[PDB]
Every structure is written in structure tokens, then in C-alpha cells.
Ligand binder design. Sequence first.
Ligand SMILES: *[C@@H]1O[C@H](CO)[C@@H](O[C@@H]2O[C@H](CO)[C@@H](O[C@@H]3O[C@H](CO)[C@@H](O)[C@H](O)[C@@H]3O)[C@H](O)[C@H]2NC(C)=O)[C@H](O)[C@H]1NC(C)=O
Ligand SMILES: CC(C)CCC[C@@H](C)[C@H]1CC[C@H]2[C@@H]3[C@H](O)C=C4C[C@@H](O)CC[C@]4(C)[C@H]3CC[C@]12C
Ligand SMILES: CCCCCn1cc(-c2cc(=O)c3c(O)cc(O)cc3o2)c2ccccc21
Ligand SMILES: [Ca+2]
Ligand SMILES: [Zn+2]
Ligand SMILES: [Zn+2]
Length: 794
Amino acid sequence: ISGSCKGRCFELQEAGPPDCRCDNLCKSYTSCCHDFDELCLKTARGWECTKDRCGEVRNEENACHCSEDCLARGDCCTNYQVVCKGESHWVDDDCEEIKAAECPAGFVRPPLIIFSVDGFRASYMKKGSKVMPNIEKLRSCGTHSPYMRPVYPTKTFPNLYTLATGLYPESHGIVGNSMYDPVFDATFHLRGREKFNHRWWGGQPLWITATKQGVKAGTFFWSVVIPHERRILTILQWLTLPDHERPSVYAFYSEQPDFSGHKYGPFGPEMTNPLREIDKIVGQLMDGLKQLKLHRCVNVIFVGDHGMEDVTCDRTEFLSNYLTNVDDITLVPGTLGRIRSKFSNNAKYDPKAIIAALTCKKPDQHFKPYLKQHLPKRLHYANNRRIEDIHLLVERRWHVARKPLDVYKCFFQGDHGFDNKVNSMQTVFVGYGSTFKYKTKVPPFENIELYNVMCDLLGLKPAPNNGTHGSLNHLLRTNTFRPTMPEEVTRPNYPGIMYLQSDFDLGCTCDDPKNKLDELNKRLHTKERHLLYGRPAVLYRTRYDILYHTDFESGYSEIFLMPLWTSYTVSKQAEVSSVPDHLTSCVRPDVRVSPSFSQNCLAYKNDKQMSYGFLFPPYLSSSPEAKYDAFLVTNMVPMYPAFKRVWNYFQRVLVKKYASERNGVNVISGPIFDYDYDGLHDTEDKIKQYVEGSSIPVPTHYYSIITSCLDFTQPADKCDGPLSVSSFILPHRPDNEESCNSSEDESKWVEELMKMHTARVRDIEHLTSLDFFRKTSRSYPEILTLKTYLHTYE
Ligand SMILES: *[C@@H]1O[C@H](CO)[C@@H](O[C@@H]2O[C@H](CO)[C@@H](O[C@@H]3O[C@H](CO)[C@@H](O)[C@H](O)[C@@H]3O)[C@H](O)[C@H]2NC(C)=O)[C@H](O)[C@H]1NC(C)=O
Ligand SMILES: CC(C)CCC[C@@H](C)[C@H]1CC[C@H]2[C@@H]3[C@H](O)C=C4C[C@@H](O)CC[C@]4(C)[C@H]3CC[C@]12C
Ligand SMILES: CCCCCn1cc(-c2cc(=O)c3c(O)cc(O)cc3o2)c2ccccc21
Ligand SMILES: [Ca+2]
Ligand SMILES: [Zn+2]
Ligand SMILES: [Zn+2]
């Protein structure tokens, strides 16, 4: 029927204007029918049955019913079985393991109910079951992690869509709660109707994926006027539909505890009550599922999108305090900063001048300017036209605004959007049901990994996303997906001594009784190692060679004229030698690689802006005889003199620090070329910078994977079990403007710079098209979880 909303409340089909919309989103489109409020939003007698209502005469106007007829219809209050038939609340029951789904007849698969909460700080869980009995049971009974890492910017819409797609915001297009698209020439906003236009949303969210493969979805979204209790009743009724009509995946959104978090702050004593009200709803969902004989059938995912941090109006940096004129720019303010020109026809707008006027211009400055391609690669926040070039990384607890006149109501005590590695931004994840594990705790993970898990829970083939499928298989009791290691594309060459030193005119010079001392060591004793996890696989068509040495091993690339990876192991008792002055400028030819596929020294001498470093540091040679291997022309990579300060301190000081701390470490280092900042390995054509007068490409970044045993009582090269990893993708910049303490000694800023650019092993793999940890004796799902690990230092 059209013009009326009878027999249609929260329907799962559509026709359009003029026929009414009776679904749960008609209120948002301002196009419900006239009887919607009295037919679909009934609210008489509340949401809980009482004892006198047990067996009532079914009065149609009630919100939920307590008659004996209601369970056949499926519209009872969630506590019917409790206050009438003597059943107990789902929380009051003991934890019974679900070794197999106990679904009623007609259920061809366990349904998935996603319970999302806005701004649910990860630390909110430590309030205990005195405040959140239902949620705490799910957490302790099912599968949970200490926290879950959101995506930058840690805002509502980018994360909620990242949850639905498994994509970074730069890939699915929702790069913020409000954004400007220069192609559309329109402005996306949280409030308004512009967000309903499909042109803003990329990728393939879960409900579209389920529908495209035959799995019925049902609307994930709810207009804010529909109370939470009615949303649960609607989800519980949908499960009572016939088999050919019942959807398999459901969703429930809650604006809490983010609503009250903005008003009172995260650690305010008022925060306890909104959590209690949330647990009431989770209890209503569980009691209603147990009432429907589905508590041992469904899978429930209790998930948040971001955390919460203390912010105040008194803590606001203003661009008017740094820029001589702020009336010619547009700023996206708040917990993050994006700057674009207010007028396109303006040549007086200089992006160079704006970055300089904001870079280390005042002590205790609570923001850092960035060209978007220079942000930490772990953020994956650049490859999109809606992301402005100038980006401001705002310190936790602080805000950035354009001028004091723009701020007004303090209209807040908490906010979010900061760097997603900040503690306050971490959120929660709880997996409970017949497919999640029982009383099992998993290590923290990123929310881009959930879309593959939800597709596996529904038997769907996931759309291409940025999760590493298989790295969360340890969340499930049984796994239908079984990951495959990528096959090698380019087999390596193992060249021997093919040329003579006379065949080389690279322009390199190097000089030539420690040997008798080394032999007196070796001879007078009473009693491979550098590639502990199998050589990396090259996942693209190229030409490269495996070069063995005493102290290190490298996959030298004849196309890029430098190694793709350099592997060496540093013992706990490894000594750090120096380099004599007559070997400081020494570079030796490698008689295993053709002179035509070798770097030349003359190119570095002509490029006044460019120097060169080494992938294996000569400072860590086992002997002066072996030190000559480190000076091979196949071991040098081009580095700016400013970056050499960062590289030298890392190799000469920090690798020895890590080995002494972690019972030896295995280092795998190499270059990264990402000139179009899309997070993927660039081919030769995209490289936009070379060494002057040569074909030696200049890397945009340099990486290093530091691996050791998790059981530190064993060395790095005799590790019987799990592995501990930590990696970084350092930007190869010609200046150290990113570090305001760069004038001081390296021990006062370099380590801080490296913690900022930490990265998962998976991040390096996308940027290098290599595959690591291939021969380790760990199950491949375990290795995938190791590659997704991000050492966050908090
Ligand atoms: C995160 O995941 C997404 C999707 O898996 C990745 O984006 C994908 O990037 C590839 C290559 O950049 C795109 O494929 C291209 O398709 C065109 C035809 O449309 C073709 O001409 C090209 O040669 C290439 O094959 C793909 O469309 C694109 N998909 C989406 C949804 O954006 C992205 O690279 C991943 N990011 C990271 C950091 O891993
Ligand atoms: C209470 C309101 C503020 C909630 C706002 C709902 C809005 C974010 C939802 C409503 C309908 C959604 C779109 C619809 O499901 C169709 C798809 C196709 C898919 O390929 C990409 C996503 C997209 C466009 C959905 C985007 C988000 C929407 C607008
Ligand atoms: C598979 C992962 C589950 C999450 C799916 N998911 C729910 C969204 C939602 C629904 C609301 O009910 C809602 C509201 O009532 C007020 C409000 O301000 C925003 C709101 O957003 C949403 C938005 C963008 C991308 C994805 C999304
Ligand atoms: Ca790239
Ligand atoms: Zn949110
Ligand atoms: Zn918020």
C-alpha cells in the first residue's frame, strides 16, 4: 500500500516518491508516511514487561507486548521470558562454550549482528562489570583484544566506513567528517543532505557485498529519532521473518559514549551513566536473542570507531599567530588541520611560505606542518584529491584554528581525530558467538582487518581491501579462509666472480698486520646466520642478484642499481668498530655485477646536493678484512647529507642498542620509491629524481625490519618459537626540518624521529613488492599477524 504505512513498518523494500518510505531511514530523507510515527514508533508502557502485563490482552498501540501470542509474532519485550516464564537474564547465565552453532530450524547460517558504539575509549573497559555487566560478559566469554587501532583521522565517518569496507580513508574517499572535492566543487559535511549523495563513497561496503552475492543485508542505518530500544526490537523481529526473507547480517549504531564524552571529557565522573545505558541495550539484545533461542547461534561484534581525549578551548593554536595573512587560506580546523587556498585565481598564495611560517617557529608548538606526501607512511593519508597538500598533525589534547574570532560556544571537554597511534584514540573490539573463540584474548589489531573477518562469517568473498586476509584467523573457532603465500615472480641470479677489476671505470678509489691477528684468533680456539627467515620474494618482473658476504647478504637489483634488501644479524655481544680515515672515502667495485649495472662514484661527486650511505654499515664488520665488503659499490645507496645524520646514528648506535636489548637482532634494510605517494612500489617511470647525470634513482624512503625472538632468553638466530618485530619507514628528506631539535646532537632527536615513522612489515611490503618471513616454522596465519604488528611505543 502507498500513502499509508500499515503492514510496512521497517520494511526491507523500496519504491520511492510518491509511495511512502517506511524503512528506518525515511526520517533522514524527510519522506516517511503520515502514520509512521503512530504505527512504527509506538512507545506505550515503555520497553520492559511487568508482572501484571504478563498475559495481557494484546493492545495494538503498545511498544512491545507481553501476551502469550507475542512470541509467535516476535514482538515481545526482551524481558518477557524473565518476568513471566521464569527465565533468567542472559548475563546471569554461566559461560558455556559453543563448540557448534545451535541454531533453530530454517537457519542456513549463523546471523551476524554488528554492535557499533561512537567514541568508545578502550580504557572504558576497565570500569568493570559493576557498570557494564552485559558487555563485560561478552568480553570475557567471547573473543576480545586489549584495544583496537582506528584509522587516521580518528573521526566518526572515516572509521565507520573503514569498518564497512576494510579500506584506508584515502582509498574509499571518506577522508574526514567534512571534506572538499575539487572535481565536484562541493563540500561534504556531517550535518546536511550532501553526505547522502553516492558520489562521495567509494569501495564496496559490507551490505553491498552481501547483497551482490545473494546474502540479504537489511538496513544498517537508523535515523537518530528512532530510540535504541526500538532498533533492537526491529532487529529481533527481522530474525523471526521467513527463511527467504530473513537477512543474515545486522547493524546497530549508537551515538554514545561519544555524545556525553564531548560534554564531560573521557575521565569525567559523568561518563559512568552513558555506559550503563549502553549496557542496558546490549542486555536487551542478548535477552531478546536468548528469548529467540539464538544466543548460542548468532555472532555479535561489539566494536568502536575511535577513542576520546581531553581537550579544552584554552588549548587552541591559532594560525593568525604564525601567518602574516590568514584571509587568503581555508582551514579545516579541530583535532587536525588541512589548509587550501581560499581563492584559486591567486598567485600570491605560496604553499612553500605557509609550511615555512609554521615550521619550528615558536617553542612548545602544539602542531607540526606536513606536505601530505611527507606524513608518516603508516597513516596512509595522501593518495586522494580530497586531501589537501598542507596537513597539520595536531598534538594530543590540543586544537588548531584559523583565528580567535572563529572559535565560539567551552563548547566541549573532549574530542578525537589525532594521530591514530595515540593511546586515547584506541577503541574496543569484542567478538562473541558460535564462530568466535571461547574465553580467548587476541593481540590488538587495526580495524581495516575486520571486513575480511565479517565476510568470512557470512561466507562472502571480500572485495579487494587493505586488510591482510588470514591475519585474524586466530579470532575464529573455525576458519573457511586459508591464506596463500604469494609465489615468487623473479627468480634470483647467484653470480660468481665474472669480471676483473680492470673492467671497471666507475671512478671509485679505495686503498688496500690485522690478518695475522685475525688468524691468531681463529687458529687458537677450542670450539645462513644472516638470512634467518628465508630470502625475500620479489613479486614483480625484474632482474636482481643474490650477493653473499661474510657479514651480510643482499638482493642487488640490476634495474635500480642498488639492493632491494640487505640482511645481517647482530649478536648481543657484537662490537661496534670505527672506520680508518684512509677508508672513509673508499668504494670498491663488485666483480660479480657488470660495470653497466653498477653505480659510479663520479655521479656522486658531480651531484653537490647528494652523498651516499651503505645498507650494511662498515661500523659493524666482524673484521677489517670483511670490512672491505661493506665498501662494495653494490652496497651503497644515495643519501642526502642531512639524512646521513639519521642513518649514521641508526646504524652505528641504535642497532647495537637493539641487539643488546633484545638478545641480538636481524636487520633487513633497503630503499623505497613512492613518488606518487599511493603506498605502492613505483616502477621506473614514476621516479622523478635521480643522481645528477646518472640513472641512479633517489629513494623517497629507507626501511629496516628489526626481528628477534619473542622469548628473549634465546638469541635471534636460535629462536624456537614466536618472533618479535619492529620496523620503520624513514623519509629520505634533504633537510631535518621535521625535527625541531635537529641542531642538537643525534641522541636528542633522531630516535624520536624514528618512533614517529614506525611501520608494519606489511606497509614495507606494499612499498617494495617484496615478501618477508617465508621460511620460519611458524604457521602462515601467525606470520601474517606478525606482519600486521605496529610497534607504537604506547
Ligand atoms: C588498498 O586497497 C585498494 C583496493 O584493494 C587499493 O586500490 C587499488 O589500487 C589498484 C592499483 O593502484 C587499482 O587497480 C587499477 O585498476 C585500473 C582499472 O580501474 C587499472 O588500469 C590499473 O592498472 C590498476 O590495475 C584498484 O582499482 C584500486 N582499488 C580501489 C578500491 O581503490 C590500494 O592500492 C590499497 N592500498 C594499499 C596501501 O595497499
Ligand atoms: C541517521 C543518518 C545521519 C545516517 C546517514 C546514512 C548514510 C551515511 C547512508 C544512508 C544510505 C548509504 C549509501 C547506500 O547504502 C548505497 C551505497 C553504495 C556503495 O557502493 C557505496 C556506499 C553507499 C553509497 C552508501 C553510503 C552511505 C549511506 C549514504
Ligand atoms: C560494517 C560496519 C558497521 C557500521 C556501518 N555504518 C553505520 C553508520 C551510521 C548509522 C547511524 O545510525 C548514524 C546516526 O544515527 C547518527 C549519525 O550522526 C551517524 C550515523 O551513522 C555509517 C556511516 C558511514 C559508513 C558506515 C556506517
Ligand atoms: Ca607508489
Ligand atoms: Zn565516531
Ligand atoms: Zn565525536
